[PDB]
Design a protein around this ligand. Structure first.
Ligand SMILES: CCCCCCCCCCCCCCCCCC(=O)OC[C@H](COP(=O)([O-])OC[C@H](O)COP(=O)([O-])OC[C@H](COC(=O)CCCCCCCCCCCCCCCCC)OC(=O)CCCCCCCCCCCCCCCCC)OC(=O)CCCCCCCCCCCCCCCCC
Ligand SMILES: CCCCCCCCCCCCCCCCCC(=O)OC[C@H](COP(=O)([O-])OCC[N+](C)(C)C)OC(=O)CCCCCCCCCCCCCCCCC
Ligand SMILES: CCCCCCCCCCCCCCCCCC(=O)OC[C@H](COP(=O)(O)OCCN)OC(=O)CCCCCCCCCCCCCCCCC
Ligand SMILES: CCCCCCCCCCCCCCCCCC(=O)OC[C@H](COP(=O)(O)OCCN)OC(=O)CCCCCCCCCCCCCCCCC
Ligand SMILES: CCCCCCCCCCCCCCCCCC(=O)OC[C@H](COP(=O)(O)OCCN)OC(=O)CCCCCCCCCCCCCCCCC
Ligand SMILES: *C(=O)CCCCCCCCCCCCC
Lengths: 99, 155, 128, 177, 65, 13, 87, 79, 459, 122
């Protein structure tokens, strides 16, 4: 036994009203009624102008203050030459060749 | 809202108990207050401590997220038995057996990590050998002192 | 045979394994019908106000008002100082105060004794 | 147990619910469709064995030990449908189920953006408020003394009446707004 | 045309997804075979593990006493 | 094509 | 994603599943065939029909709504009510 | 809009493991009612699905062919 | 300080001579002018306080409390003008007069060079607060709440009167600037013990201390919105201000007198925060959160280390802004559901998205999300109390769990979940209410950019 | 890994303990045993900023490999021979550590047989 005839009649009437409501949720072709309202610009406004701003800020406000941009000194190998000095680092001791 | 629909003292006569059950909108044979030991419950019903998760989810509730109706007497800990908090729902494994399995598994794992720490594994090698008196200046030794001569040999 | 389900405080008995669910006696039928009647009356009384187009506000639930009044206002007029409330109020009220007092007092006596004797490493400690 | 219309579950309904839950938890145990198909026909045979038991005491006892059988032999994480309570997508879109009365609180610059929709909504509200008094006097003339016994609602009886307490069933939001 | 849903049968496949999937599967097996051919020691081993029993006592310094 | 009205609260304010 | 259902499509798929059931002859079946009184099916068979509807359309019908669907038309109407078709 | 379903008569369970299930059910006096409902999963383009080592070795033939061509290319390139 | 006292008193003719529809706009405009003028108090030096006269000075402790106080009046006027719109015009002007008079007492409470004048203004702040609560509170229990608020403060402070007059007779002066240099070490005796208690328990009640805090979940809840804003945001912080002044005179006895009260706070912030996990009244949840946050300020003042005073005054300013905004949010929902039950109105992000974002920001600042000054004060107090004892971090850290737990539960109960069906009077958010939320939150987030102005006299 | 069974399921008397060894003099059994020659100067690997683990007796091949890897950027597949030299010399150092371990094991066997010969003697 399924629904009673009262419950069947109520579900049919509610079904009719529900389908009427859901069909009346649709839009008109005029709706929505709206009010009356350069190829690499992303490479310019988002890359290049922040590079300009940050380079100015680092170069003339951050590097002008002591120990703000502290950098690890570059790695000196036996056989290198200093750019500020010219003193060639002497190479390593001759190897006890293994293979 | 009025005074005789607000909670009152603990019912001691059966007609006051019936008036309390009529107030809390529930049957007199279903109405059970908290035991009068002086904890401030008064006539408030002792509902059987079920979480709101255990309620029938397919029912057309008045409050679907709380799974609770209008006029229904709330549990004293209704803020505690919401579905965002303490769940009393039945679990397929017994609670005591779950506690046995969890405590035994955790205790066995801790004991076996202690066994592995007491008897650790290693490789069949010597110590790693470092030059310059076991790297005295590199480890932060002061150069005005002088360490004992650590000398490694060939093999 | 099978291991029987043990209900706990945090793991209730299922409805299907409950024996009192299977009571076909007529007094349980009257209880279930009377509970259905109370719930149907409250449901009707709710959704008459809830579907009313003239209503624009809060359908006040006296169960919720009654619960919030029971949690706050009715606690002290239904308090009786007896043995149970006194032992639970002195065990849970001034118990941990005593506990943390002796813990922090013992720790600070130990730390001050180590500091004034030159034992505690306070080498770079200059923020305090 | 807890039903809106009936005050209880009958023995026949308890057997049907045990049968459905046994097939679902068995399908959770029996992932592949042919293996579940075989064992589901075996479980149907077990349910069709004790079908014609006339002693309600013996039938209730068999149902009770069958529930014990099921509780010992259920899947720990059974299959749940996604929009079913406990599923991964259950009550997911409740944050988009905005009620209808919020449309009454719009500014006129965004009500005029949809002229036909609100011009059609006004006759819904009109039909609702002139159906309301007829369906209230329908409810207070049909309900027995002592309140309604069950939570069931009557249909519309006349040609022109709408069914009583209909607005929050018809104007509920869609499940996918 | 876009993929239309079907009922109780195998869905419509694009040629493009099949040739992309087969290209990356062949790329996976090409890379595995390439790096196993050239390296061959990151899996099997780089240097031979010596046997410590095979070392004589003369190089390990054990005077027989 | 069968565009449905999305009910949302008043985002004007 | 998620193609919208219609009443005709739900009807075709419901009768399609019921024609694939060996205890139903596909020459007698209509949309209004009561399962217990026209097709003569058992209550266990009606539960299996509702479960095949669940596996067909991918959502669960609850038991209080499962027990009251006694023809294919009420099943199509229930799936229409729970899917909001012909919006 | 309108979607035309395939025929309900074509999904027969001969040639499927549903046939084996019906045989092992009818060996003990049972009968399977929902075989033709499940018959689409084991037929059509969803029949003859690959094994696990067949799933892992997808594109192993073309990858090995490109491997042999590249090894021959670097063998010719050194000389 | 007389460039601030006289405009605050000229706010009385500005509200009693105004046209009947202009009495909110004029008072809002000129109180915002006074709040813009308040920035001149930021002339602070690393050595000397900004010393104006024999009666008034302002160091870096009193300056942020003054700027917050003079800022809070326009926000209270915006908050309290909706629910007092049906009020009589004379009682409306009397309410504005009580707010102006309370600001007037507060700005010369924080600038009192001398401590008995501090006492007179400190207890003068009771009477407009008492009248606002017991006159424009909504429910029945405003009368009882005003009784508890009056008689905890007076019972704590009438021994403070005798103690301060004893200091005037013994040391010769109650000028704070003199007592910076004439302070004697307070030895161990029972007389000096009750000297310490009489100097401290008034401010213990005003903070509030745990166990003595029973006035506050009645006084803050039964008040109107302006009363709750000024009670949470300023009137609790009189206790921290007064303790930071008066523990100058209580050394080295505080070093062994603070031990019970620190416990009462270190346990109290565990209890009251836990109470916030079970509060059905949302406004009471915010009240117990205020108790839980001021417990840290009590601990930090009683351990009297520099990091503790910096963190305690940062926590005072930050909690003033955050708690005032949380009370205003609770009012913004009370003016739509006409109840304070937190479980009643749910799912409010589905209906009010920007107001839900203001709830989100106030809850994140409540749970001390870095780099807010909430977290700066919270963190610095936790640093100093780790230096005090290494075990306190447990009572700190568990608190920082529970402080998160009710801060998001308040966000999940009210704003998230399924909306309540039957409540349909949920209006869209007014421009006034969002203006109130933004004027709370935007100064609070701007103070994360430059927090050194809210870190006290020993930055 | 069989030494785990020889030390745990066996005895710890004849097995060398890992953390404290060598427990013998290095001259005990070696006539004229030469020292280990460190190739890289301490200032050279100071300026090469090597990790303190990496400053072992075979750091000079690593210094050559890092100099190559800097000097061959972006061709990051062009210093395989220097890396192979460093890996081979690390293998040689590992072999020397294995020789020290086997030396300690054979000396503890020698002491065990010595004390057994002394116990059977008198
Ligand atoms: C002195 C000059 C200073 C200039 C710079 C100012 C710097 C910021 C100051 C504070 C800004 C607050 C204003 C925005 C939030 C409040 C309003 C709002 O929600 O509007 C939404 C709306 C956009 O959303 P919508 O779709 O329209 O509606 C919202 C939806 O309904 C649904 O809403 P929703 O939930 O989807 O959207 C809200 C969303 C929700 O997102 C969240 O809640 C997540 C945020 C927390 C986690 C992530 C951040 C964690 C911390 C990292 C960042 C700080 C450190 C970084 C530094 C480096 C590392 C140290 O939040 C945001 O989108 C805000 C992004 C920025 C967050 C900043 C941190 C706030 C978190 C809480 C406190 C944390 C500690 C303090 C930090 C203080 C920082 C200054 O925004 C506006 O309309 C903006 C209006 C203009 C705002 C002006 C603000 C400044 C006013 C000051 C005036 C005087 C000085 C002059 C300067 C003026 C500058 C313009
Ligand atoms: C909010 C409720 C709680 C409030 C708590 C308030 C503080 C608790 C302690 C207060 C003690 C009373 C004031 C002490 C002032 C001390 C000033 C001073 O010079 O002291 C040294 C003086 C010493 O005298 P002297 O200074 O002249 O002596 C010269 C110095 N020697 C000692 C060397 C000779 O102390 C006293 O004379 C007495 C001090 C104790 C007073 C005890 C009576 C009051 C009991 C407690 C009442 C508490 C509040 C009651 C209400 C509660 C709620 C209803
Ligand atoms: C390096 C060492 C590592 C050591 C690791 C072990 C140490 C820690 C020990 C465990 C502590 C944490 C675990 C216990 C609390 C977990 C609480 C929680 O997450 O509850 C979740 C629960 C809902 O969960 P669930 O039911 O799964 O959700 C799906 C819905 N059906 O949600 C709810 O019920 C809501 C609850 C809200 C209120 C929370 C109340 C509990 C708060 C507990 C705080 C504990 C603080 C401990 C601090 C110790 C510091 C030393
Ligand atoms: C102690 C005790 O059991 O006191 C019982 C007494 C009432 O006695 P009764 O049980 O009525 O006989 O109860 C009383 O006399 C009242 C309470 C006794 C004293 C309790 C002191 C501590 C209370 C908690 C303080 C929390 C802060
Ligand atoms: C309930 C609401 C929440 C709570 C709010 C606050 C309530 C408590 C407020 C007062 C707490 C006690 C006072 C602070 C104690 C600090 C240390 C101290 O004085 O200990 C008590 C004392 C210890 O002995 P000792 O220090 O040697 O005394 C000689 C002093 N020259 O001990 C003794 O000598 C023994 C006891 C003697 C009697 C003490 C009574 C007077 C002090 C309390 C008033
Ligand atoms: C001796 O066994 C040294 C090796 C390290 C300790 C034992 C590790 C056991 C697991 C690795 C080998 C697994 C072989 C299947």
């Amino acid at each position: 036994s399924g629904y009673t005839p009262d419950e069947k009649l109520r579900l049919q009437q509610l079904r009719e009203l529900r389908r009427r409501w859901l069909k009346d949720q649709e839009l008109s072709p005029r709706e929505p009624v709206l009010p009356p309202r350069r190829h690499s610009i992303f490479a310019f406004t988002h890359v290049l102008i922040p590079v300009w701003i940050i380079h100015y800020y680092l170069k003339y406000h951050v590097t002008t203050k002591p120990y703000t941009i502290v950098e690890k000194k570059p790695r000196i190998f036996p056989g290198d030459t200093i750019l500020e000095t010219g003193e060639v680092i002497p190479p390593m001791k001759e190897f006890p060749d293994q293979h | 809202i009025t005074k005789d629909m607000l909670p009152g003292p603990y019912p001691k006569t059966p007609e006051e108990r019936a008036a309390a059950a009529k107030k809390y909108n529930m049957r007199v044979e279903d109405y059970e207050p908290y035991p009068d030991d002086g904890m401030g419950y008064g006539d408030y019903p002792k509902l059987p401590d079920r979480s709101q998760q255990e309620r029938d989810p397919w029912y057309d509730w008045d409050h679907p997220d709380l799974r609770l109706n209008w006029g229904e007497p709330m549990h004293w800990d209704l803020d505690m038995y919401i579905r965002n908090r303490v769940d009393t729902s039945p679990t397929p494994v017994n609670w005591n057996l779950m506690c046995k399995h969890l405590f035994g598994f955790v205790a066995f794992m801790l004991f076996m990590f202690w066994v592995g720490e007491t008897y650790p594994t290693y490789q069949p090698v010597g110590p790693k050998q470092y030059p310059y008196n076991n790297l005295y200046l590199e480890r932060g030794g002061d150069p005005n002192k002088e360490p004992e001569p650590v000398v490694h040999y060939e093999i | 045979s099978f291991p029987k389900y043990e209900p706990s405080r945090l793991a209730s008995l299922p409805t299907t394994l409950d024996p009192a669910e299977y009571d076909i006696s007529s007094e349980t039928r009257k209880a279930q019908a009377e509970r259905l009647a109370i719930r149907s009356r409250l449901k009707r009384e709710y959704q008459l106000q809830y579907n009313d187009p003239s209503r624009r506000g809060v359908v006040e639930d006296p169960a919720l008002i009654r619960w919030t009044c029971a949690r706050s206002a009715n606690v002290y007029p239904n308090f009786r100082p007896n043995t149970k409330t006194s032992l639970l109020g002195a065990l849970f009220g001034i118990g941990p105060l005593i506990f943390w007092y002796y813990v922090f007092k013992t720790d600070r006596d130990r730390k001050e004794k180590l500091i004034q004797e030159g034992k505690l490493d306070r080498t770079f400690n200059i923020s305090y | 147990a807890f039903l809106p219309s009936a005050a209880y579950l009958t023995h026949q309904q308890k057997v049907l619910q045990l049968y459905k839950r046994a097939l679902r938890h068995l399908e959770s145990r029996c992932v592949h469709r042919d293996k579940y198909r075989y064992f589901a026909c075996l479980l149907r045979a077990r349910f069709d064995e004790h079908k014609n038991e006339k002693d309600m005491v013996k039938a209730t006892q068999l149902l009770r030990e069958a529930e014990k059988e099921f509780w010992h032999g259920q899947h720990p994480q059974p299959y749940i449908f996604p929009e079913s309570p406990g599923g991964t997508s259950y009550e997911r879109y409740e944050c988009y189920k905005v009620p209808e009365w919020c449309l009454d609180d719009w500014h006129p610059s965004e009500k005029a953006m949809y002229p036909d929709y609100f011009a059609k909504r006004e006759q819904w509200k009109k039909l609702r408020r002139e159906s309301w008094e007829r369906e209230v006097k329908q409810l207070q003339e049909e309900t027995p003394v002592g309140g309604p016994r069950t939570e069931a609602l009557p249909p519309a009886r006349k040609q022109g009446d709408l069914p009583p307490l209909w607005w929050h069933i018809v104007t509920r939001p869609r499940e996918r707004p | 045309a876009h993929i239309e849903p079907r009922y109780r049968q195998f869905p419509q496949l694009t040629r493009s997804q099949v040739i992309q999937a087969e290209f990356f599967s062949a790329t996976m097996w090409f890379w595995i075979l390439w790096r196993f051919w050239h390296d061959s020691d990151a899996v099997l081993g780089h240097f031979p593990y010596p046997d410590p029993s095979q070392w004589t006592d003369e190089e390990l310094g054990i005077p027989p006493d | 094509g069968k565009r449905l009205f999305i009910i949302k609260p008043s985002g004007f304010y | 994603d998620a193609p919208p259902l219609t009443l005709e499509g739900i009807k075709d798929r419901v009768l399609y599943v019921l024609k694939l059931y060996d205890k139903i002859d596909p020459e007698k079946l209509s949309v209004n065939s009561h399962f217990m009184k026209d097709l003569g099916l058992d209550s266990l068979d009606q539960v299996e029909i509702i479960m095949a509807m669940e596996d067909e359309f991918g959502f669960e019908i609850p038991d209080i709504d499962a027990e009251k669907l006694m023809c294919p038309q009420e099943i199509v109407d229930y799936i229409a009510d729970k899917k909001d078709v012909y919006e | 809009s309108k979607m035309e379903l395939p025929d309900y008569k074509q999904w027969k369970i001969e040639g499927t493991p549903l046939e084996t299930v019906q045989e092992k059910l009818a060996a003990r006096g049972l009968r399977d009612p929902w075989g033709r409902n499940e018959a689409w999963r084991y037929m059509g383009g969803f029949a003859n699905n690959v094994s696990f080592v067949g799933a892992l070795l997808k594109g192993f033939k073309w990858g090995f062919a490109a491997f042999v061509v590249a090894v021959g290319a670097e063998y010719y390139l050194e000389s | 300080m007389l460039k601030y006292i006289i405009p605050t008193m000229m706010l009385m003719p500005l509200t009693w001579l105004s046209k009947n529809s202009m009495i909110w706009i004029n008072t809002t405009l000129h109180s915002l002018l006074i709040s813009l003028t308040s920035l001149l108090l930021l002339n602070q030096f690393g050595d000397n306080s900004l010393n104006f006269s024999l009666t008034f000075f302002s160091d870096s402790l009193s300056t942020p409390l003054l700027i917050l106080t003079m800022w809070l009046l326009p926000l209270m006027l915006m908050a309290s003008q909706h629910h007092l719109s049906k009020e009589n015009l004379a009682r409306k002007k009397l309410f504005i007069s009580m707010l102006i008079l309370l600001q007037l007492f507060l700005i010369m409470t924080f600038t009192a060079t001398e401590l008995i004048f501090f006492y007179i203004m400190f207890e003068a702040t009771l009477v407009p607060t008492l009248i606002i609560i017991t006159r424009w509170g909504n429910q029945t229990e405003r009368l009882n709440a005003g009784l508890y608020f009056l008689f905890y403060t007076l019972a704590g402070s009438l021994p403070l009167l005798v103690a301060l007059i004893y200091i005037q007779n013994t040391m010769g002066s109650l000028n704070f600037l003199i007592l910076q240099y004439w302070v004697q070490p307070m030895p161990n005796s029972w007389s000096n013990t009750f000297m310490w208690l009489a100097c401290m328990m008034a401010f213990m009640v005003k903070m509030p201390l745990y166990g003595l805090h029973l006035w506050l979940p009645k006084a803050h809840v039964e008040a109107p919105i302006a009363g709750s804003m000024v009670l949470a945001a300023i009137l609790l912080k009189l206790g921290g201000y007064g303790m930071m002044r008066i523990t100058l005179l209580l050394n080295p006895i505080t070093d062994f007198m603070a031990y019970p009260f620190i416990m009462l706070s270190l346990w109290g912030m565990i209890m009251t925060s836990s109470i916030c996990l079970r509060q059905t009244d949302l406004k009471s949840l915010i009240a117990y959160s205020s108790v839980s946050h001021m417990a840290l300020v009590i601990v930090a003042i009683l351990i009297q280390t520099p990091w503790s005073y910096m963190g305690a005054t940062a926590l005072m300013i930050a909690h003033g802004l955050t708690s005032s905004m949380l009370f205003c949010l609770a009012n913004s929902n009370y003016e739509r559901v006409h109840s304070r039950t937190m479980i009643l109105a749910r799912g409010l992000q589905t209906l009010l998205p920007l107001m839900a974002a203001w709830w989100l920001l106030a809850s994140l600042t409540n749970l001390a999300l870095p780099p807010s000054i909430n977290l700066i004060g919270e963190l610095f107090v936790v640093m100093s109390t780790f230096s005090w004892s290494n075990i306190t971090i447990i009572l700190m850290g568990l608190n920082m769990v529970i402080t998160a737990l009710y801060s998001l539960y308040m966000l999940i109960t009210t704003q998230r979940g399924k909306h309540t069906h039957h409540i349909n009077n949920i209006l869209p958010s007014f421009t006034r209410e969002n203006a109130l939320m933004s004027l709370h939150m935007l100064p609070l987030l701007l103070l994360s950019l430059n927090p050194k102005i809210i870190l006290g006299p020993l930055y | 890994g069989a030494h785990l069974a020889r030390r745990y399921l066996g005895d710890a008397s004849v097995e060398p303990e890992p953390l404290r060894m060598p427990t013998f003099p290095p001259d005990y059994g070696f006539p004229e045993r030469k020292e280990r020659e460190m190739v890289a100067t301490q200032q050279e690997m100071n300026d090469a900023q090597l990790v303190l683990q990496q400053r072992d007796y075979c750091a000079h091949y690593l210094i050559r490999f890092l100099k190559c890897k800097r000097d061959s950027f972006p061709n990051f597949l062009a210093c395989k021979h220097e890396q192979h030299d460093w890996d081979y010399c690390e293998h040689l150092d590992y072999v020397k550590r294995m020789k020290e371990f086997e030396r300690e094991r054979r000396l503890l066997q020698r002491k065990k047989r010595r004390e057994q010969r002394e116990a059977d003697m008198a």
